[PDB]
């Protein structure tokens, strides 16, 4: 079985700059390697096959090179729609199969931007149903790496939150993150101070947003 | 026009079955090898199965061997995927794809892809969401779209009149087996008294349509 490893997992570049994506195979695949592009919410599409052959209709700005175990996909001059995920791919014979790399995502590099943080208590409508969701919003920050810690009456929470992050914004190149702390109505009513503490490269000290009630 | 169109996706209980179809148009279907490839939500691509142009041999990923069967009907230009004994880990968008090679048993690349169809395997049943307000010189407000199944939901603000500063987040799958997502918008603090904010949520699987006014 062949394993394909793509690096870096995320490539941070500017529009128009040259993108160089790498794919390393565990053992030789000769020149039998393909690259696919997947734009967010869309099906993948073939870009290159046989290491350097551009698929039909693919613009000349996409080019592939390499052989054996070292392959590169070059995008000579990035367009807005090119900030997408790219996968390399080959065949395996033992067992027979098709192997994909784990993907490299291209993002627009911009200046560091600290998040603007907001906390929302559970609505009275939700409390009438037996559960309490507390939401913390980290808005328009860069880079994507951010940490949210929930604290209830000054006690760090663990195992009772979930979060997700938006795709990079097309206009300002930032990300936003939403975290939800879930408690039963009975547990929510036993505590007073609800706080979300945010750490990020753009913050010299963690920022806390909080409210009292429950 | 050259294309592949999948059908038959939906929700299925663990241990049960589902059969997908893929209608091919615009090329000599009987001259190409055909594949199924899947993508679990937020994960990478995983090849599932291949069938030779004349249907005389097939191969499968070890993850689906024995449970899934790829087949084709060259007289109807249709490819099938029979999925039996389904498990939660089979939840994915399933794509049918044409092999690049013409009348060649050596399979290697996917040169044409369908649109994909979502298959969700879970003990949960189809359910519309509950929508709760996230009440508010910049202010933030939103809507929490909780406890729905399966994906997806769409959210708009003020019937589409409000788009700037809107962020609709990817859903999370809760331990209950139901999804939850938030949608927020940042506005000038002075607009809280002059403008009304309503989130419009749609969940097509349950035919749910909700309008929720979000007040300070």
Numbering used by the authors:
A (entry chain L): 1 to 95, 95A, 95B, 96 to 212
B (entry chain H): 1 to 52, 52A, 53 to 82, 82A, 82B, 82C, 83 to 100, 100A, ...
Kindly provide excerpts from the paper associated with this entry.
Through adaptive evolution, these variants acquire mutations in the spike (S) protein receptor binding domain (RBD) that binds the cellular receptor human angiotensin-converting enzyme 2 (ACE2) (1–3). The RBD is the primary target of neutralizing antibodies in naturally acquired or vaccine-elicited humoral immunity. We demonstrate mechanisms through which the SARS-CoV-2 receptor binding domain (RBD) can tolerate large numbers of simultaneous antibody escape mutations and show that pseudotypes containing up to seven mutations, as opposed to the one to three found in previously studied variants of concern, are more resistant to neutralization by therapeutic antibodies and serum from vaccine recipients. We identify an antibody that binds the RBD core to neutralize pseudotypes for all tested variants but show that the RBD can acquire an N-linked glycan to escape neutralization.
To identify barriers that restrict neutralization breadth, we performed single memory B cell sorting with the SARS-CoV spike protein to mine the memory B cell repertoire of a COVID-19 convalescent individual (“C1”). From C1 peripheral blood mononuclear cells, using a prefusion stabilized SARS-CoV spike protein (S2P), we cloned 17 cross-reactive antibodies. Among A3, C6, and A6, only A3 competed with binding of an ACE2-Fc fusion protein, suggesting that A3 blocks cellular attachment. On the basis of its epitope, in addition to retaining activity against all variants we tested, A3 would also have activity against emergent and preemergent SARS-CoV-2 variants; these include a variant sequenced from travelers from Tanzania that contains the E484KRBD, T478RRBD, and R346KRBD mutations, and B.1.621 (Mu), a variant detected early in 2021 in Colombia that has since spread internationally and contains the E484KRBD, N501YRBD, and R346KRBD mutations. Despite the presence of the N-linked glycan, A3 potently neutralized RaTG13 virus pseudotype (neutralization IC50 value of 21 ng ml−1), suggesting that A3 neutralization breadth extends to preemergent coronaviruses that are closely related to SARS-CoV-2.
